[PDB]
Design an enzyme around this catalytic site. Structure first.
Site, PDB file in Angstrom:
ATOM      1  N   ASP A   1       4.843   2.178  14.589  1.00  0.00           N
ATOM      2  CA  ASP A   1       4.459   2.071  13.183  1.00  0.00           C
ATOM      3  C   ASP A   1       5.063   3.308  12.533  1.00  0.00           C
ATOM      4  OD1 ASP A   1       3.294   1.913  10.689  1.00  0.00           O
ATOM      5  OD2 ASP A   1       1.246   1.707  11.433  1.00  0.00           O
TER       6      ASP A   1
ATOM      7  N   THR B 118       6.241   0.775   6.382  1.00  0.00           N
ATOM      8  CA  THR B 118       5.894   0.695   4.996  1.00  0.00           C
ATOM      9  C   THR B 118       7.271   0.836   4.308  1.00  0.00           C
ATOM     10  OG1 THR B 118       3.933   1.451   3.797  1.00  0.00           O
ATOM     11  CG2 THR B 118       5.703   3.083   4.181  1.00  0.00           C
TER      12      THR B 118
ATOM     13  N   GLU C 161       7.719 -19.872  -0.740  1.00  0.00           N
ATOM     14  CA  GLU C 161       7.059 -19.943   0.564  1.00  0.00           C
ATOM     15  C   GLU C 161       8.007 -20.429   1.648  1.00  0.00           C
ATOM     16  OE1 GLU C 161       3.694 -22.280  -0.771  1.00  0.00           O
ATOM     17  OE2 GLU C 161       2.304 -20.624  -0.361  1.00  0.00           O
TER      18      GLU C 161
HETATM   19  C1  LIG Z   1       1.077   4.144   5.087  1.00  0.00           C
HETATM   20  C2  LIG Z   1       0.778   3.565   6.467  1.00  0.00           C
HETATM   21  C3  LIG Z   1       0.554   2.215   6.607  1.00  0.00           C
HETATM   22  C4  LIG Z   1       0.720   1.278   5.412  1.00  0.00           C
HETATM   23  O1  LIG Z   1      -0.304   1.445   4.434  1.00  0.00           O
HETATM   24  P1  LIG Z   1      -0.349   0.461   3.156  1.00  0.00           P
HETATM   25  O2  LIG Z   1      -1.163   1.346   2.096  1.00  0.00           O
HETATM   26  O3  LIG Z   1      -1.167  -0.719   3.509  1.00  0.00           O
HETATM   27  O4  LIG Z   1       1.023   0.283   2.643  1.00  0.00           O
HETATM   28  C5  LIG Z   1       0.322   1.688   7.851  1.00  0.00           C
HETATM   29  N1  LIG Z   1       0.331   2.495   8.953  1.00  0.00           N
HETATM   30  C6  LIG Z   1       0.564   3.839   8.820  1.00  0.00           C
HETATM   31  C7  LIG Z   1       0.660   4.721  10.063  1.00  0.00           C
HETATM   32  C8  LIG Z   1       0.775   4.378   7.580  1.00  0.00           C
HETATM   33  O5  LIG Z   1       0.955   5.730   7.450  1.00  0.00           O
END
Ligand SMILES: *Cc1c(COP(=O)(O)O)cnc(C)c1O
EC number: 2.1.2.1
Length: 470
Positions: A218, A244, A65
Site C-alpha cells: 500500500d 492513493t 460502468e
Molecule cells: C492515504 C492512505 C490511504 C488512502 O486514504 P483515502 O483517504 O481513502 O484516499 C490508504 N492507505 C494508506 C497507507 C494511506 O496512507
C-alpha cells in the site's frame, strides 16, 4: 411560461461566484488559509492546475460502468480512450512490463482501493496482517479492540497486526515471521501511514511465500517517491500494489490497484504453467462487486498527474522532498529533538516530544493556532494512544510551494518556537492538568498576544511562496 425557462438555462450556465456566493466565499477563505499557512501534514499536497481543470470537465456526466471493451452502456469511445490511456500511463510511471503487470484505475480513493483487493483475494473472514495502527499503520490495514472491530477490514475480514520494535523504531520482521506461522494470513500488507523508513519488501515477500499468502503493498504515502525512483520500488517483490492518487503523487483524490499478470508458477516435471488470475478477480471486485459508475473526471485528473509524474521536473521535486526532510530532521536533531529511528529515508519524520518534556496532542493544537499544520501520532513505546508523544511532519506540501533546505531549517525554528510556547502553557496550567484545560489556556487572554505574534511571523513567511491551484 418561458420567462422562467430562460432563467433555468441561465442557472446552469451561471458562474459559482454568482450562483452560490456562500460556497464561493468558503472556497476563497480556504484558499487564503492554505496560502498563509505552513502545511506539514505528511498526507497533504497541492494538485496542479492542469489536474484541477480536468475535474470540472464534461467527463462528470458519462456513466461508463464496466471496462474498456466490456461496458454496460454504449457511447464510450472517448471514455475508453481515457481509461486505457490512464492505465497505460500508470504502468509507464512505474516502468512495468504490460505483460507482467496490469492496473485498475477506477477506485474512488485509497481506502476503496484496498477494500476492493481484500474482497477479491482474501474473501469474507479471510485473514489479513498489517502494521499496527498506533505503530504507523492505516485503518484499512485492520483495526479492532477487545470490544469491537472498528475498521471495515476488521469487520468483514479477520485481521491481526504486526508491530514496530519500541526500542529501535523499526518494524520487527522477526515477530511477524513467527506470528504468521500461527495466524496463517491470506494476505500481508506492506505499507504505512506514519513510518520514516523503507520497507524490507524482499523479506516480507519471503514471509508471505512461506505462508502461501499474497504480499500487497500500500504505497499511498510514497507513491510519488517510488515513481521518481527516490525510494526502492515495491513492485519487484509484491503481488499487488495499491495506492492513493493524491498525497506524494500530487493528483486528485482517487486510487489505483496494480496486479501481477502472466506466469505465476510452473510444474518441474509436467512443464504445465499456472497463470495469475489477479486481473479478473480484482476487476470483478471493483465492478460489478463494489462500485458503480466510474468517476471519469477523476480518472482524467489521475491520467494528467501520471504524465507529470514522469517528467524531470517531478523527479527533481521528489529528490528535493527527501533532501528537505533530511534538512528538517537534522535541524531538529541538532536542536535536541528525538526523531524516531533517528532519521528518515522518505518525505516524513516522527518527532518524539518526550525529548522536550511534552506530547503531540498539546503541541498539535498550539502549532495549529500559529498556522503550523501537522498531526499528533503515537511513538513506539507509548503506553496510551490518548496521550501520543509524537508529531508527524512531512515535507511534500511545502516542497511543492518552492521551499528548499534553508527554508525548512527556518521552518524547523518556527516549529521549535511553537514547542516553547507549548511548554510554557503546559507548566502554567499545572502538571496534573487535562488536555481540556490546556486548550482553554491556549485560547485564553494570557497567551493571546504570544500566539498572534508567532502566527503572524509564520503567515508572512508562508505568504512569500506561490500556492499551486487557481
Ligand atoms: C492515504 C492512505 C490511504 C488512502 O486514504 P483515502 O483517504 O481513502 O484516499 C490508504 N492507505 C494508506 C497507507 C494511506 O496512507
Amino acid at each position: 411560461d418561458a420567462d422562467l425557462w430562460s432563467s433555468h438555462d441561465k442557472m446552469l450556465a451561471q458562474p459559482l461566484k454568482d450562483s452560490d456566493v456562500e460556497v464561493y466565499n468558503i472556497i476563497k477563505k480556504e484558499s487564503n488559509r492554505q496560502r498563509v499557512g505552513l502545511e506539514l501534514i505528511a498526507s497533504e499536497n497541492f494538485a496542479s492546475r492542469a489536474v484541477l481543470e480536468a475535474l470540472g470537465s464534461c467527463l462528470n456526466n458519462k456513466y461508463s460502468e464496466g471496462y474498456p471493451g466490456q461496458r454496460y452502456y454504449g457511447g464510450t469511445e472517448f471514455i475508453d480512450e481515457l481509461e486505457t490511456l490512464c492505465q497505460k500511463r500508470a504502468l509507464q510511471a512505474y516502468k512495468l512490463d504490460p505483460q507482467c503487470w496490469g492496473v485498475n484505475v477506477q477506485p474512488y480513493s485509497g481506502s476503496p482501493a484496498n477494500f476492493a483487493v481484500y474482497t477479491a483475494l482474501v474473501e469474507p473472514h479471510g485473514r489479513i496482517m498489517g502494521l499496527d495502527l498506533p505503530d504507523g499503520g492505516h485503518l484499512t490495514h485492520g483495526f479492532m479492540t477487545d470490544k469491537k472491530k472498528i475498521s471495515a477490514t476488521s469487520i468483514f475480514f479477520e485481521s491481526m497486526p504486526y508491530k514496530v520494535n519500541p526500542d529501535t523504531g523499526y518494524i520487527n520482521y522477526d515477530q511477524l515471521e513467527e506470528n504468521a506461522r500461527l495466524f496463517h494470513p491470506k494476505l500481508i500488507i506492506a505499507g504505512t501511514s506514519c513510518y520514516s523508513r523503507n520497507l524490507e519488501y524482499a523479506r516480507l515477500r519471503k514471509i508471505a511465500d512461506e505462508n502461501g499468502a499474497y504480499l500487497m503493498a500500500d504505497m499511498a504515502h510514497i507513491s510519488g517517491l517510488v515513481a521518481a525512483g527516490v525510494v526502492p520500488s515495491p513492485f519487484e517483490h509484491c503481488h499487488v500494489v495499491t495506492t492513493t492518487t493524491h498525497k506524494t503523487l500530487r493528483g486528485c483524490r482517487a486510487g489505483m490497484i496494480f496486479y501481477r499478470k502472466g506466469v505465476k508458477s510452473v510444474d518441474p516435471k509436467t512443464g504445465k504453467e499456472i497463470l495469475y488470475n489477479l486481473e479478473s478477480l480484482i476487476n470483478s471486485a471493483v465492478f460489478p462487486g463494489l462500485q458503480g459508475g466510474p468517476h471519469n473526471h477523476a480518472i482524467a485528473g489521475v491520467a494528467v498527474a501520471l504524465k507529470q509524474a514522469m517528467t524531470l521536473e517531478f523527479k527533481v521535486y521528489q529528490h528535493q522532498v527527501v533532501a528537505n526532510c533530511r534538512a528538517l530532521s537534522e535541524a531538529l536533531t541538532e536542536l535536541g529533538y528525538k526523531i524516531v529511528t533517528g532519521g528518515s529515508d522518505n518525505h516524513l519524520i516522527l518527532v518524539d516530544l518526550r525529548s522536550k518534556g511534552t506530547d503531540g496532542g498539546r503541541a498539535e493544537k498550539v502549532l495549529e493556532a500559529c498556522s503550523i499544520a501537522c498531526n499528533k501520532n503515537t511513538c513506539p513505546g507509548d503506553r496510551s494512544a490518548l496521550r501520543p508523544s509524537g508529531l508527524r511532519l512531512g515535507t511534500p506540501a511545502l516542497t511543492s510551494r518552492g521551499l528548499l533546505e534553508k527554508d525548512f531549517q527556518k521552518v524547523a525554528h518556527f516549529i521549535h518556537r511553537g514547542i516553547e510556547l507549548t511548554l510554557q502553557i503546559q507548566s502554567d496550567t499545572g502538571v496534573r492538568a487535562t488536555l481540556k484545560e490546556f486548550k482553554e489556556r491556549l485560547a485564553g487572554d494570557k497567551y493571546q498576544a504570544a500566539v498572534q505574534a508567532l502566527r503572524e511571523e509564520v503567515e508572512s513567511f508562508a505568504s512569500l511562496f506561490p500556492l499551486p491551484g487557481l
